[PDB]
From a paper:
The overall structure of apo Vfat shows the typical transaminase fold, which is comprised of two major domains, the small domain and the large domain.
Two molecules, subunit A and subunit B, were detected in the asymmetric unit. The theoretical molecular mass of Vfat, including the His-tag was 52.79 kDa, whereas the measured mass was 103.72 kDa (0.89% fitting error), indicating that the apo-state of Vfat also forms a dimer in solution. Interestingly, however, the two subunits in the apo form of Vfat showed different side chain orientation at K285 despite the backbone folding in the vicinity of the K285 in both subunits being structurally analogous to those of the PLP- and PMP-bound form. Specifically, the side chain group of K285 in subunit A showed a similar orientation to that of PMP-bound form, whereas the side chain group of K285 in subunit B had the opposite orientation. After careful analysis of the structure, and by lowering the contours of the Fo-Fc map, we discovered a small volume of electron density around the substrate pocket of subunit A. After several rounds of restrained refinement with Refmac5, we determined the electron density for the small molecule to be around the substrate pocket in subunit A. In addition, a small molecule in the apo state of Cv-ωTA was not found in the substrate pocket.
Residue numbers in the entry:
A (entry chain A): 30 to 311, 313 to 454
B (entry chain B): 4 to 21, 26 to 150, 164 to 455
The structure:
Amino acid sequence: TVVVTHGEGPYIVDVNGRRYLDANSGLWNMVAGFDHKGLIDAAKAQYERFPGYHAFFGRMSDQTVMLSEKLVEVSPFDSGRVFYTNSGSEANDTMVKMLWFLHAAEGKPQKRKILTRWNAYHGVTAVSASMTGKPYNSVFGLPLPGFVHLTCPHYWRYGEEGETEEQFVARLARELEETIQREGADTIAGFFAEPVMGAGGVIPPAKGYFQAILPILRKYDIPVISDEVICGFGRTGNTWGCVTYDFTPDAIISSKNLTAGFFPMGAVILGPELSKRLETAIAIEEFPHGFTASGHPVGCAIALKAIDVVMNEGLAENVRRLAPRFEERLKHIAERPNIGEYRGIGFMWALEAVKDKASKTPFDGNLSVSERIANTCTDLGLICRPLGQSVVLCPPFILTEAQMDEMFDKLEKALDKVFAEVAA
Amino acid sequence: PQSWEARAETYSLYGFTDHQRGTVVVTHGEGPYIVDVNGRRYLDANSGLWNMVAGFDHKGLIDAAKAQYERFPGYHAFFGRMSDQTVMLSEKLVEVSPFDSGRVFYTNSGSEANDTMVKMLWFLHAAEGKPQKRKILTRWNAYPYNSVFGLPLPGFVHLTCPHYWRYGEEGETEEQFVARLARELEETIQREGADTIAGFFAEPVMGAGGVIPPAKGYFQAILPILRKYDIPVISDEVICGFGRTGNTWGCVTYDFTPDAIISSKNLTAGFFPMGAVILGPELSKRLETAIEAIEEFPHGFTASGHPVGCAIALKAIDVVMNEGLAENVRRLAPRFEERLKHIAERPNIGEYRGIGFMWALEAVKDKASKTPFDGNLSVSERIANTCTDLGLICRPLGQSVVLCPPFILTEAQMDEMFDKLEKALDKVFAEVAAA
């Protein structure tokens, strides 16, 4: 219904001039808001310079060159190699294929299975949707075979009766061990994880999880990929989600914040060990047949600028400084009887609605409580995403204290109204 | 690393090249040329990779792209009505397509669109009662680790590529060859079972396969067979779409009507990542009826394309269709072919093939037996590298080299292209002979 022609700062602006505080950041990507002049200028400058090209082995743009160097610098790696795609979905697909390729070139063509978790979200293509752990993909006959889903490390939802958080994590480690032993370590190509699950509902991992599963993965030579599509470039209060949760992956998948939402592109940052193994493999005396993944020079120039903005013009810092206030206000909202929990970190958070708090019982699906909240928020000039029984706050990093208050004021009005109505 | 080359080589996957390539870092272009950091100019006979059909400094398209950023849209995952841009592009696509009506779904690339169409078929067949109708009929083949990046989605069933020169039996006419492939298709449907087949995907002219136009009469022979069965026909126009074969679509050039079209890149003339799935009227209806029944709406399909991409696509479409670029293809194709004919008189050219502004030359060690050079000799690669040394970009594929230059190419630039390619072929073939 609402006609939108542009945005300003963190606001979507309709044709009548109504401003809607966008706590979805567009598509979880507009970290610097909708009309950032530096980013717009960088886009325009690159179109004037060199408006499209495709990267080949031995022939690429200067922008591909500079972005690759920047990305290694700000990665957790001392060295490595980067390639690009058009999206997070294709970056995930292409990393899978690169593992399949590498393992095949190393004499283990059976090493194909991909480990993810239930409630993971990795993309919409057939492979990345198979990696994804959502029930909605059953309508496509997905997942494809060889996409194995581990328990989601969401302690509040999956912890058994009287199971402590430490016990839950020990259980998830057993499960992983046993899945690896059952499948065979030689048949498993890699493990991919969002440090904080994004589209599955903003789900930080149980305490200690990555510390317990990483040694097991390493023991069995299963490559570790961090999917930083949502976490990446500051959303969790460090540059990467994997930093915030102290694990060193073998590669990083990036998109979204990469270009501050201003251009569709993905990137895969290969760490030193995968990089050396791929170099040596490429022994076969040729380039991988059919590998044609490429980004775009405009996307690369915009990404260079997005990185600079985020890291050198205060935006990642604003997330670190305002995260405590953000959580405080959430903690206060979670005192309500119909809020089961708040969860998140840095500038990504969710509130889960419940009909009964002690039992964690949701409202019946048919009441659309999440959606009701989300629609009421929009009536009140706030945009937030309903996911399952939750609503998500993922706002631009440029959010001011006043705008933060505005967000919560609106949201609290929405919650009062909606919870009162469903009570009637 | 200080130098551009060394920066490339140390931080980019694409810089790992160590018949060797050497590293070209490109900064800008002009018409069909690209220019590197050292000032070397190269005629880019691959149009980037197929998509840069208006070249590298087209002012109308640059201005249009810039203008989109100047006023960036309120582009959102779910809030607010579809942008005027996207609605208008969908109308335009339906209009220019072969269909009188249909629906459009958008992606960020030709690859994603392809994949989205597959998923669509899986959804639709499963909704209609046949969740085992999943196989895709395809002509794809490899040239173990060598079939990872190209390998279609699980359940693909392979048909023989209708490349007469390659696959024709000794003394088999082209006509008989097409009749044999029609038998293959019949046999393959009976063996797999029609009820297990989701669709048939075909690039009218096979692109990543080596630029292979189909044998005369192929589509006329296979389409009637596919129509006996409710196997949806998908025209993969990621390369052929918007003029490269001399018509707006590849399926117009080979005179057939698909159920849907996959489009990519060249939608925006390479200026912006986009793909589209254009469903014709039958599949639109079935898709609608499926959604309002099992009642989900399929996740990840979107009728809302990126608004910047959409405005750029509209401009690109108008440039190609109405500012003479598609016509220039049609006008210069005869001359393209005549020169290739001449080049194919060489003993180490087994054939030329192609159509419009997409062509390939295939190298052979012994022409009469169609014997290729030893794979280790990497002859295509050698040719391509030599082209680069001489200011020409062309693309090695298998034992072939491919030309797909921008549509703005003039006759003089075409002569330049061939002049440099002929000198490359002279040098490579002599050095191969000499060793």
